[PDB]
Symmetry: D2
Subunit: 284 residues, 4 copies
């Protein structure tokens, strides 16, 4: 992707037909370039209805997910491949251009001990098979590094790149998230530097998942480093005003992240757009 | 507690006799004013050996714990009270001045939904009983706010203050932790601002539990805000370097937090001391 | 002075009748609580017209100036007192509540050596006389610390407080400016900390005099520290956008500080108001 | 230059023979790679004495200056060329590898109005001639952007690059200074970004000229952006513990920048070395 986008938890809990209507209508009011749609219940997504909305309103889209425990790639790789194939097909059917997020495991996945080579070997096989299926449907895959409490396998930019090189495909990119990097990166710019050759998507998410510009993320370091590495991918907001039920346990939003979507979008999006112009990011 | 201290996890998580000696030796090496003693198994602590060590070396101390699952206050308050009474007595008998930490629950609590009045009612009953026991032994209790993933009940300075007000004791204080605040506070200074009437203790920990000064924590805002509220409590350095593996895994340490002790202590403690001097906490 | 205000330089440096109307119109457009009126030529100010504008539009005001070279307090104290008395009377008569700024000297003072006791004695004699005149008219005086290149005498919060103590008046306060503190203070919060007992006014200005929020000022540390000291004075936005060229050149503006008013006010004012809300100054 | 260095105002007020002895001894105690020597009194410099000190102690060096008013390039270009030729020759004779700083004007230079094309024409002619003379002596020239109060002509990384492109000499590099960028750059990383193709030297100088790490400079943004652009030049401290008399009026140090040299070097150098390590700067 390119330009500015929003994860649709800003506006709807589930990507059902009324939720798709609500999210797409809210998106055009902010003049964003794309939306990111959760692919958490693929058989439940009405792809024809979503595609019609996206094309009517000239909105691009990608999808993201976390794997359900029955299909965690680290331990149940055959089930993961089957699940990812379903999710890839539905993403392509609605006009999405990539499937990203925690496509290699669960949001809330934790064995209780550090990750093992056997787990990474399983993940690499899953992603290799999924990337071939994605290629057959004309979409790319994204691997999002998330913090230690949401997954034990891929937490940093450097680990995400290590997995992309372990898999050896040509259609998997790295997806970073400033909320996760705020915990995981030894200096937030290091995550961007480490991922630079594969970085195509970033969640500009505040440290408490609230309003960008009004938490602890080091935004000037983030934007300066994105400009320096020539970042030209998707800049996407992620604030859990609404919480998709299938990932609520893992995402740990126990209290409102902000007053409402009007506060987050009304203050956060102008802040991020202004920072992108300030540091001269490509496309700004 | 006043001045600079260290949480002894970098040398000792099991407070047995050689572990106590090892941690006191480190405290003298780094010229700190106090130590924080983790109590993984309060019944096993030799109170007289530790008391003698502290007095001989002019070191002050407090203790900290998190409740085990069999005694999580929100659901098993009678067992929480029993566990806390033992820890309070051991703390007092070794010469400690407070028991702090996750004394209201455990690492690993998560319901998937917001905390409830029923849960908070049980925590308040536990903390009231524990505060009474602590007062009878002449020590205080600290409530450490921890991030959303560790516990769903007390995550912010403002939530910690709400619980202290709900209990209505006068010997419970707020314990903040810059690693947790880096996630939970809407601007890191707001945790200190919200807790200012009750803040007596802060863990100075980097955002990745590594070396203070070399992460994402907003140290200038932290120290300026501490100075502005006139903070004179404990400045306690905390790093997860060299934690025993089983403890580290329980805290979601899946990879090294830093290179070694010389990196963490040789760079992190001077950074924190220098910042405290810069902003007049000294 | 309380709440949010603007220095009117962005619309009016020459406070004549159309300029006063222009600035008050801008103040209502941006829904501020007060304006700061620069007084380049105090005798030319129509006090009755300005007073009626402020009362009709429910606007509060203060005034500011820097001393011209013919009246630099450090070297020409009697001329400085005559100049300040005229400015104080004009301020009081138009309804302003204080005269602040570089009232102790001028932009462009520099001896090449540290400030001397002789200079500070002259400044103190000037300020003492001016403060008594201000008290007789019911207004206060503000001393604005400015950076080393503008004036060699009062650069930090701690220097400003020392001058307030040297003068010994009770109606002189400290006026800080985030642009100057960005250069002068050893950690920006230290200027607020050092001035805390006397700080009643702060210029919120970006590091390049452009758009607040989009430079190098440490806004989170600034706002957290203001909240922590209980700041209840004036929060006054200052930008050099659209200043008259001759005034701008005297302030070392050699190139545009920002694109236009819409960039500065449309991005910078919401940023500052949002930060004030975030840290509970509101 | 490469590695870590120190401007010798840390240790001596003038580069006389006793001052050279003291500064070189101090530089070895801190194990820095080079020193930066003010070339403010070229006829007074004992070049063989300094050259012998540097070679004996395996220390590299460069020189810096500001032009005296009698030879300000923007208004007296012929005098400026003659002065720079003298300074270039002394720099080369003592073993220095470059002459940097405000080689295009004065520290404290101010007309009262914005810079004009005629002034830039004069600087360009001066630098072109100085660049050829520097080439003949085998050294390079650096152009340091300084803040609006020290010079009205070159204040930003982008302005410095514009001059270097205008002159067209490949032996002139850009020299940035975090103390100056703290005022001049709209986000400090923008100075590094704008200068990335020509940046070979940076003063890591705190916002009040005191101890690095204990002022207002955005060090994490600075180091992350330097790493992102692949900076491989000199990282040099500048703290005016001692003040060269010829530039004191322009540098505006009216009160101690720090307690003493041991405080700045004892706390500031480890901080900067640690940050360079943290962000993986080339050569650290
Ligand atoms: Mg994300
Ligand atoms: Mg802690
Ligand atoms: Mg001002
Ligand atoms: Mg310099």
């Amino acid at each position: 992707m390119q330009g500015f986008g929003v994860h649709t938890s800003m506006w709807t809990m589930n990507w059902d037909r009324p939720g798709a209507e609500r999210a797409v209508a809210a998106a055009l009011k902010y003049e964003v370039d794309f939306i990111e749609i959760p692919m958490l219940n693929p058989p439940a997504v009405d792809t024809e209805h979503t595609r019609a909305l996206l094309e009517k309103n000239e909105l691009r889209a990608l999808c993201s997910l976390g794997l359900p425990e029955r299909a965690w790639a680290s331990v149940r790789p055959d089930a993961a491949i089957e699940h990812l194939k379903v999710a890839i097909d539905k993403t392509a059917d609605l006009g999405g251009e990539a499937l990203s997020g925690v496509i290699y495991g669960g949001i809330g996945e934790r064995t209780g001990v550090p990750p093992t080579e056997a787990e990474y070997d399983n993940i690499a096989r899953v992603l290799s098979a999924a990337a071939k299926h994605a290629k057959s449907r004309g979409i790319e895959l994204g691997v999002e590094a998330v913090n230690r409490y949401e997954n034990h396998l891929i937490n940093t930019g450097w680990q995400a790149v290590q997995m992309i090189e372990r898999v050896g495909a040509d259609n998997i990119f790295v997806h970073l998230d400033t909320y996760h990097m705020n915990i995981e990166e030894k200096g937030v710019g290091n995550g961007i530097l480490d991922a630079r050759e594969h970085l195509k998507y970033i969640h500009l998410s505040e440290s408490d998942r609230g309003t960008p510009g009004y938490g602890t993320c080091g935004w000037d370091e983030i934007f300066s480093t994105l400009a320096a590495i020539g970042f030209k991918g998707g800049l996407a907001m992620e604030s859990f005003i609404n919480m998709p039920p299938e990932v609520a346990y893992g995402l740990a939003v126990w209290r409102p992240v902000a007053k409402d979507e009007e506060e987050v979008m009304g203050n956060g999006l102008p802040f991020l757009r202004n920072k992108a112009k300030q540091y001269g990011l490509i496309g700004n």
